Ligand binder design. Sequence first.
Ligand SMILES: Nc1ncnc2c1ncn2[C@@H]1O[C@H](COP(=O)(O)OP(=O)(O)O)[C@@H](O)[C@H]1O
Ligand SMILES: Nc1ncnc2c1ncn2[C@@H]1O[C@H](COP(=O)(O)OP(=O)(O)O)[C@@H](O)[C@H]1O
Lengths: 252, 252
Amino acid sequence: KQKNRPNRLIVDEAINEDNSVVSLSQPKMDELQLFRGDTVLLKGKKRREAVCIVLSDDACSDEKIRMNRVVRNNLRVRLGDVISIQPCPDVKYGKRIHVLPIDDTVEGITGNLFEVYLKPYFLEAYRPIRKGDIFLVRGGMRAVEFKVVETDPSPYCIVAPDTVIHCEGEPIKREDEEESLNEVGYDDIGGCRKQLAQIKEMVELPLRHPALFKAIGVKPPRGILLYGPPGTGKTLIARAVANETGAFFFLI
Amino acid sequence: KQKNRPNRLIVDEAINEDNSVVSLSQPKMDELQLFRGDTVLLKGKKRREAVCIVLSDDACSDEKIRMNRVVRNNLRVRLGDVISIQPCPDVKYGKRIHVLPIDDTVEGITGNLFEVYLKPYFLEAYRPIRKGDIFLVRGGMRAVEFKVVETDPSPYCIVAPDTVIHCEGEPIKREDEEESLNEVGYDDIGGCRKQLAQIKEMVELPLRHPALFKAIGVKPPRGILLYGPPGTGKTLIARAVANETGAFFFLI
Ligand SMILES: Nc1ncnc2c1ncn2[C@@H]1O[C@H](COP(=O)(O)OP(=O)(O)O)[C@@H](O)[C@H]1O
Ligand SMILES: Nc1ncnc2c1ncn2[C@@H]1O[C@H](COP(=O)(O)OP(=O)(O)O)[C@@H](O)[C@H]1O
């Protein structure tokens, strides 16, 4: 079976903000035999899957794939990891969905969540979904998460205008496996691109591949000193780096 | 029943010093069908009532009502609250009243309180009263409070020249519900208007509506630093703010 050359890419940062658009470059797209708007299927770590509409861009390489933080966290991968891509031409429109909120997120929210949040989200935008994911909607000076529990053409479909939604039930608990989305990441840092590039390349090898430094005698850098006027967000950059590499973070 | 548009106003600061004059603007006054000098009836928090002569002014909005600190404290409301207004054309002259002092206020006062204090107060000024209120008279380098206990056309009337007063009895105790009137308020701060406006708008939302900051993620200001030469009354301003919002005050 052929899997190495047509079906391998490397995750990196995103430029678009939609939680379903995955951006890649045109040579890979006519190599994969995929056109714009076609729903694609991604497999990552721990046999997790995701369905996403595709899009083309130019400011990419021929092995890099740009995905948003929600879809990336939905596959359990981190930046610099590899995934598998496939065409999925057998998705159908749904006829029944059931969604729940996360209790950690809904606090002091009064009224009904349906007509304020889930009504403008699935409005005039055909969005694909798979059972057991988590998506995020922003508004009312808050950001609320939602977990899909069921799907009528199980286990994945596309949201069509005539797809009823039964938003019935009580909040569900966040388990000890997925991480929160109110945490810090590289997307929550405006400006300062060159310095971010430097720090990212400076801690890439010791924190991503730790076993490599048992096979070579080479000393990686261990002392970093950030400086600048107060109010420039340095602890932010620290927590960001520490969260995106999955490393442990202690604060003195 | 119609109550929202003709019978709702918002309390604010006063410009006059009389304990019976309540000031409002001419559009609301000819909307309520009220003329000058007519006794008006106010209902506030905890089904408290008050009878007051009315007056017109121009430096107001069309939903703000200016009342003195005595009448405001008599309704249990604070600044920025809402009250109900009504016309009360069925007040009559009294024929017997009975008033007592507050023991916390009378200290070292010798002689009789009647002819020195209660004689010039109800002199050539028709003043309305209701049973169970508290009013304040100034003189002799002191300020003495008085509580009405009974009224002959019960439970409210107007003081006419031929209304006898039986100032008979012993001092009464201040209970644990009403606050004193020798405390600090915005009226006891001369000058410094712009800075007062700034500090009042800076602590309005967190201290008046605390539940609102469980429904939005927005950080209110928490650090304030007052400065100026010594002798400019800064702790005064602090106690003032803390008393007018009803907040707890700790002093280090
Ligand atoms: N470049 C930036 N991008 C995003 N937010 C920033 C940036 N610079 C400052 N801030 C914001 O202002 C504050 C500045 O960071 P700082 O007060 O030094 O860190 P912290 O209080 O989190 O230890 C943070 O709350 C952050 O939200
Ligand atoms: N603007 C003002 N309005 C009213 N009284 C003031 C003003 N400025 C100063 N004072 C008076 O002078 C004193 C100045 O305040 P201060 O001596 O700093 O506070 P305290 O002695 O109460 O700790 C107070 O007793 C106050 O009565």
